[PDB]
């Protein structure tokens, strides 16, 4: 019984909030990512990095506050508080974007700690760690979007900023510059997310509407005992219904619940891979055959050519304000516009 | 339009003329489908995590369930014991009917708002 | 001619589309919300030009 | 003197249908990008 | 349309090779 084993006993005590060894990584980092976001969206500006207001103190609301990315002139600096840019000056650190790397890096390590928590708790309780495994997709997404994507670009400036409307800007940037809707890795991601919502709703509704009558009340929730051995709904009747409604149905309860893990998890993983491509601007931007025909044939038009004209509008109308460090000056006469508008 | 790229054109022009991203019903639709995919994974992984040992390691664990069997193939008390400790005890369901009603309600209500 | 400005948009595989770009194109803006069944057209050729199939579908 | 570690492999008909569906739908998705 | 000529063989093998693999596994499962 050394000090290590005694520390291990106290870390793994059954308390209201389980701690564990993983808690030593998880709680400091999660609390500081959280607290850093709340601090920045309440009090901190984006004036010197972006030319934007971004806090409640400046008059923004919940939708328009953000902790914004640092200026493009910072490259991929860690922006340490004691590092060479801020030099330990907290006020200047805030003004230069230091809270962004602060949240992003503590957040990455917080996610690691949360997954380690899933492993730790599963092992103590004696269950398989499929839930830790499912959490790799959020991690894949976070790392690809917030770290890998800006590491391949010029600077952290182009990562997502931590805010509601800032993320909408990110969405629209990816349409106008990357044509990301056309990307098959995003299309698989879409299918996995909407298919997961579909599975979530169809499974819950099926169970609720094939329940056995295990009580006399009209609220059916009381007629379930968590220690009962018996299934609470009828797999046999659920199966017949969907077989005759839709043609096929699940028949294996284990395959069904494994499928529910698999579909959204695989979807996020595929979308992560497409974003790694966009780190290098390896877009699925065009279809070459369409461009060759369109360039030669002014009467050829498809929904693909129409969408590029939209992308061209997004780029030219949003770039001067969105990338102020470039000092884009576009005279009115070069802005692409259709008739009248 | 009835097409893949036509859908995208519809979405882009819609954002131009309605600022749908800044509309709370669409924001609720995103919570509906993100949430649905999250809870789909959660429920899938938690039931899978607590399957009862019924097979050897050279067979698919799926063969541990037989179509129409009376007993459950997973230990919901174990799943609750894991998930209650992952968050805290009362953030976790112990009533299968309440849990599955939640699974139905969240994405359905979310997509009502986006529609 | 989805937009009623005599600018036909090609939506079908045989007219130079692939799976990702192809579509059944919405009916002409000149039609608005008017009902446009096949039998209101002077010909199938007219019905096709103006986006009849979209309404039917 | 045969090897004791050999095992038969299995694919049931449902898994064939699922797997054939995955492949065909993946081909339908990527074929446009292959033709470009 | 001026498409990539190797796209036909790429698509063809993309379908054939994994499909044949599954069919092989399935038919030998049935015959045992």
């Amino acid at each position: 019984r050394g000090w290590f084993d005694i520390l291990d006993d106290w870390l793994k005590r059954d308390r209201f909030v389980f701690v564990g060894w993983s808690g030593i990584l998880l709680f400091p980092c999660a609390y500081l990512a959280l607290g850093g976001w709340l601090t920045g969206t309440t009090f901190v500006t984006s004036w010197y990095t972006h030319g934007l207001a971004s806090s409640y103190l400046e008059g923004c609301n919940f939708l328009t506050v953000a902790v914004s990315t640092p200026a493009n002139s910072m490259g991929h600096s860690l922006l340490l508080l004691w590092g060479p840019e801020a030099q330990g000056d907290f006020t200047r650190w805030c003004q230069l974007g230091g809270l962004w790397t602060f949240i992003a890096l503590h957040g990455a390590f917080g996610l690691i700690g949360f997954m380690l928590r899933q492993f730790e708790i599963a092992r103590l309780v004696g269950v398989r760690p499929y839930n830790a495994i499912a959490f790799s997709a959020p991690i894949a997404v976070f790392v690809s979007v917030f770290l890998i994507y800006p590491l391949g670009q010029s600077s952290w400036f182009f990562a997502p900023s931590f805010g509601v409307a800032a993320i909408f800007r990110f969405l629209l940037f990816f349409q106008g510059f990357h044509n990301w809707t056309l990307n098959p890795f995003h299309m698989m991601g879409v299918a996995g997310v909407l298919g997961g919502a579909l599975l979530c709703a169809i499974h819950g509704a099926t169970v609720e509407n094939t329940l056995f009558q295990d009580g006399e009340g009209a609220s059916t929730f009381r007629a379930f005992n968590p220690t009962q051995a018996e299934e609470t709904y009828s797999m046999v009747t659920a199966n017949r219904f969907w077989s005759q409604i839709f043609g096929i149905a699940f028949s294996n309860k284990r395959w069904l619940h494994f499928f529910m893990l698999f579909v959204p998890v695989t979807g996020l993983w595929m979308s992560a891979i497409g974003v790694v491509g966009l780190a290098l601007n390896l877009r699925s931007y065009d279809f070459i055959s369409q461009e060759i025909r369109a360039a030669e044939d002014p009467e050829f038009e498809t929904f693909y050519t129409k969408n590029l004209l939209l992308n061209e509008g997004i780029r030219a109308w949003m770039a001067p304000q969105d990338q102020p460090h470039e000092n884009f000056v576009f005279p009115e006469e070069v802005l692409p516009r259709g008739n009248a508008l | 339009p009835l097409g893949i790229s036509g859908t995208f054109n519809f979405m882009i022009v819609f954002q131009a003329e309605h600022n749908i991203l800044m509309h709370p019903f669409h924001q609720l639709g995103v919570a509906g489908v993100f949430g649905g995919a999250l809870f789909c994974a959660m429920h899938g992984s938690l039931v899978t995590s607590s399957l009862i040992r019924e097979t050897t390691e050279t067979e698919s664990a799926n063969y541990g369930y037989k179509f129409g069997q009376e007993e459950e193939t997973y230990n919901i008390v174990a799943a609750h014991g894991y998930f209650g400790r992952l968050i805290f005890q009362y953030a976790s369901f112990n009533n299968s009917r309440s849990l599955h009603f939640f699974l139905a309600a969240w994405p359905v209500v979310g997509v009502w708002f986006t529609a | 001619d989805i937009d009623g400005i005599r600018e036909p948009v090609s939506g079908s595989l045989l007219y130079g589309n692939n799976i990702i770009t192809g579509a059944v194109v919405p009916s002409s803006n000149a039609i608005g919300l008017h009902f446009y069944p096949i039998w209101e057209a002077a010909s199938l050729d007219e019905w096709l030009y103006n986006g009849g199939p979209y309404q039917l579908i | 003197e045969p090897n004791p570690n050999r095992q038969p492999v299995e694919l049931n008909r449902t898994s064939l249908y699922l797997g054939l569906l995955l492949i065909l739908v993946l081909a339908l998705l990527f074929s446009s990008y292959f033709f470009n | 349309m001026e498409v990539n000529q190797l796209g036909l063989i790429a698509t063809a093998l993309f379908v054939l090779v994994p499909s044949v693999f599954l069919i092989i596994l399935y038919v030998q499962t049935e015959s045992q």
């Binding site: 046999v236 199966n239 077989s243 043609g247 096929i248 149905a249 028949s251 | 037989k66 179509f67 129409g68 | 595989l13 045989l14 692939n18 799976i19 | 049931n12 008909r13 449902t14 249908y17 054939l20 569906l21 065909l24 739908v25 081909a27 339908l28 074929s31 446009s32 033709f35 | 349309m1 498409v3 796209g7 036909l8 698509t11 063809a12 379908v15």
Partner: peptide, 30 residues
């Protein structure tokens, strides 16, 4: 050739629908 390829793949999928439904492994109460 690309049109034929798209339609061929689509047609195989519809054929798969037919077998998946009408020639499934029947769910038996075991």
């Amino acid at each position: 050739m690309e049109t034929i390829t798209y339609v061929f793949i689509f047609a195989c999928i519809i054929a798969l629908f037919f077998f998946a439904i009408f020639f499934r492994e029947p769910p038996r109460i075991t």
